[PDB]
Design a protein around this ligand. Structure first.
Ligand SMILES: Nc1ncnc2c1ncn2[C@@H]1O[C@H](COP(=O)(O)O)[C@@H](O)[C@H]1O
Length: 421
């Protein structure tokens, strides 16, 4: 079907498991000649050449890319995007998949995203910020309870009653941090239902849906403890109906891409909708402007289509249908004890050699030294397995995980548990 230029040098920006997953996929493309990741990490060195340049060193990255004749740059994390790498690259004539600074604002500013979804009729949790008690009060009292109250400067209360919400909102203003605008309180609609991650390739108004993943954000078994970058994920997600999926594509993803374009911020890249499946249909929690982590590690193994060709087709504004395997994929994050708090580095990791070769081991935060492996970051590794069903992928993933010994790491035993229940 689609022809593109073969023997294309590709650069991936980032250092994590998402970027291990995007490099591992890229390396399998019949289109790719040379594959660099800047800065990557020692498990990524197995699939790609590492480049010792920071993600935020935009001028070095531009100079590296001109000089090593990079045909495609794919940006992993959001900070480079929020800093204008795409803008710099385009002005230099370098081809890049990722949003402009102005488009990436959809993730950077939750206020801006709320503002855009309100103006364009996009379903989401109601959101409002106040520096006045009396105005906070009058608003809490129209909206009623349960209600989220958020204090700046733990400070998140899901107030079960109106009286509690007011007590919490009053405290937020009296004890929260005094910014240059005074103290402020954030009030949000509480939503119930099942969370899901809906990513799509986007170029302007053109939206190309990926598979649907579910992430597990809480640190501990039974969705306990604080929130994290994500402790595991799987795809597909059988308890989210096709109808909910289509509602979210037509009432959320397609209108956000339009809204960004209508505001003179067209988006190019991965638009990642963090969603709730409510009784009333799907509702935005947040938007992200790039692949989710650990969502990329579980979605990208299911993609049949060549990843580099799909990116090029998207950048060209070409027609494309993405093809996916029937097999489910589930992934478990091993994190350094203490994460998402203060965590210890430098614990020896044994047993990486013992893992079956069809297991997918995505390095996020490891170091290699004197021929051994050590923890070096909050999320350290993700192990995913494929399975004919979700339960089989769950079984495979956990069985393989147990080959790893590290007294400095922990992981959730309940990834996927509800979905199989
Ligand atoms: N309005 C909401 N309704 C339900 N869950 C939420 C809401 N906001 C945040 N969360 C949860 O808290 C996590 C952290 O997102 P955030 O609160 O924007 O940092 C999300 O990934 C959700 O799992």
């Amino acid at each position: 079907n689609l022809y593109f230029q073969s023997h294309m040098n590709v650069l991936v920006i980032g250092r994590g498991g998402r970027e291990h997953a995007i490099a591992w996929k890229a390396a399998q493309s019949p289109l790719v000649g040379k594959l660099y990741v800047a800065p990557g990490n020692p498990g990524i060195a197995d699939v790609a050449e590492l480049v010792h340049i920071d993600e935020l060193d935009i001028e070095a990255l531009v100079q590296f890319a001109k000089q090593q004749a990079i045909d495609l740059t794919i940006v992993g994390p959001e900070a480079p995007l929020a800093s204008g790498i795409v803008d710099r690259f385009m002005a230099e004539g370098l081809r890049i998949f990722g949003p402009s600074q102005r488009a990436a604002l959809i993730e950077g500013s939750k206020a801006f995203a709320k503002e855009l979804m309100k103006k364009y009729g996009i379903p989401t949790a109601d959101h409002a910020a106040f520096t006045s008690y009396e105005e906070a009060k009058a608003y809490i009292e129209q909206k009623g309870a349960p209600i989220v109250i958020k204090a700046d400067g733990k400070g998140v209360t899901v107030a079960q009653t109106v009286e509690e919400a007011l007590a919490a909102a009053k405290a937020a203003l009296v004890d929260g941090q005094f910014g240059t605008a005074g103290s402020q309180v954030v009030i949000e609609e509480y939503l119930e239902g099942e969370e899901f991650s809906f990513m799509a390739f986007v170029n302007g108004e053109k939206v190309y849906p990926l598979a649907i993943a579910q992430d597990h954000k809480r640190a501990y078994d039974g969705d306990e403890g604080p929130n994290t970058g994500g402790m595991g994920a799987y795809s597909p997600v059988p308890q989210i109906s096709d109808e909910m999926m289509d509602a979210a594509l037509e009432a959320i993803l397609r209108p956000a891409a339009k809204a960004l374009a209508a505001e003179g911020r067209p988006f190019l890249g991965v638009l990642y909708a963090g969603l709730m499946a409510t009784a009333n249909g799907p509702k935005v929690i947040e938007f992200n402007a790039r692949f989710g982590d650990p969502e990329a590690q579980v979605v990208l193994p299911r993609l049949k289509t060549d990843l580099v060709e799909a990116v090029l087709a998207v950048m060209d504004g070409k027609e494309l249908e993405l093809e996916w395997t029937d097999e489910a994929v589930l992934g478990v994050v091993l994190a350094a004890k203490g994460y998402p708090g203060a965590y210890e580095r430098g614990a020896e990791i044994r047993g990486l050699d013992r893992i079956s070769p069809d297991a997918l081991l995505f390095h996020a935060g490891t170091k290699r030294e004197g021929g051994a492996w050590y923890t070096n970051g909050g999320r350290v590794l993700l192990l995913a397995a494929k399975g004919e069903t979700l339960a089989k992928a769950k079984e495979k993933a956990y069985e393989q995980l147990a080959a790893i010994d590290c007294d400095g790491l922990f992981y959730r035993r309940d990834i996927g548990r509800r979905a199989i229940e």
